[PDB]
Every structure is written in structure tokens, then in C-alpha cells.
Design a protein around this ligand. Sequence first.
Ligand SMILES: COc1cc(-c2nc(C)nc3[nH]c(C)c(C#N)c23)c(Cl)cc1Cl
Length: 219
Amino acid sequence: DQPMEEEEVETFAFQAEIAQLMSLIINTFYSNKEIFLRELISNSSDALDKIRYESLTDPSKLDSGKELHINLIPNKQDRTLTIVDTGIGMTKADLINNLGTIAKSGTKAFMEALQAGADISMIGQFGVGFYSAYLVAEKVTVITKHNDDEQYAWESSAGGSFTVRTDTGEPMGRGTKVILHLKEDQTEYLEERRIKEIVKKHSQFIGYPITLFVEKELE
Ligand SMILES: COc1cc(-c2nc(C)nc3[nH]c(C)c(C#N)c23)c(Cl)cc1Cl
């Protein structure tokens, strides 16, 4: 009897400083956790800038999709909030290199800044705003598709390690989906009014369409 599907899964250890940062973020009390959404939307915007830039000299880069946008998808039943863009996306090497195994100088620098009295809301200036997801999420899954490459899924519950595998569930044209599996006491970020007010407050200058899709699985 053959399996419906099979995926090779790799587990990698986080670089020491990244593990340190994740533990600080996911455990420490902060009063302004809503900034995570600003940081994720900012990373979407950057990724959309990148594919747009590439398309200026090579229009075929948009064969995987011309529309450049950001979607926000709360799912109360799964207790997940997902941010999706049609940006440049990432290769497997990109995921392994840029989401865990190699720590840029900004990682240690950010933790130093916090020790010196800086606020968590500055985290994007250090290039590690992604990890602010763990302010509100117990687990984060990143599904990504780059041109000419297959679709991958990165995942971590911040245990000091993350996994990478091929993802074949729902094929994306191009871009990145960040799925936040929210902590039990952070479900306010699934509410329409909360999402709207955070986007209005922090993302006014993002130069791409941002669209809410409220998700409900029907009985
Ligand atoms: C600059 O650092 C990062 C950037 C990214 C990222 N990259 C691309 C190419 N697209 C994206 N879209 C979203 C919504 C991201 C987020 N968050 C994101 C990720 Cl997943 C982790 C880190 Cl650490």
C-alpha cells in the first residue's frame, strides 16, 4: 500500500544568537506585541520591491504573476493568522541561510540594543523583524515559492531548531506565506477590527494593496 505522499524533511539547528533572540522574544513580556504585523507586512513590501525591481529588466519574471499585493488571512477555527505576498519568494538555500543558520550582525546588535534600553518596536531596523512573530505565535510556518524553483515549507516552534521540506499542498504562483499559529491568549489578532486598526496605524505608507480574507470552514 503506497503512501498518498512522501516528503523528505530536514532539521537544522538555529545559529546560537538567533536561538537566543527567539527565546527572549517568545518568553518575555512586552506591552506592544501588535508590532509583529507591521514587521511582517514590511517584509512583504520589501519582497514585492525585489521582484518588481527584477521585472524592470526582465518582464518574464512576472510570468508567475503580475499582481503585486499582500493578503491577510485570519482563521479562527485553526487559530492561525496568515500573511501572504506575491513577492520574490525564496529558494531552499534562501530559507536555510536567511531563516536560521546564518546570523547577520543585526541579530546580536538588536539584543544589545534591548539591553541598552531600546524598544522591541525597533526590531525591523536590525533586519530581524520576522522573529517578532513569536511575540504572538507558538509556531510559525513559512511557505515560499521562487521563480524556477519548487515550493518549500520552513517551520519552527522555537525549540532551537527548524525544519524544511518540499510543500505540495496548494501550489503558489510566486511569493511567501507566513502562517502564525497563535498563542492561546493572543487570539485578538484574528478579529477584523484589531487587524484593521493595526494596519491603519502602522502600515499607512506601504505601497501595495493589502486585502483581508476572513476564513471560515463551513459546517
Ligand atoms: C529579511 O528577513 C526575513 C525576510 C523574510 C521574508 N522574505 C521574503 C522574500 N518574503 C517575505 N514575505 C514575508 C511576509 C516575509 C516575512 N516575515 C518574508 C522572512 Cl520569512 C524571514 C526573514 Cl528573517
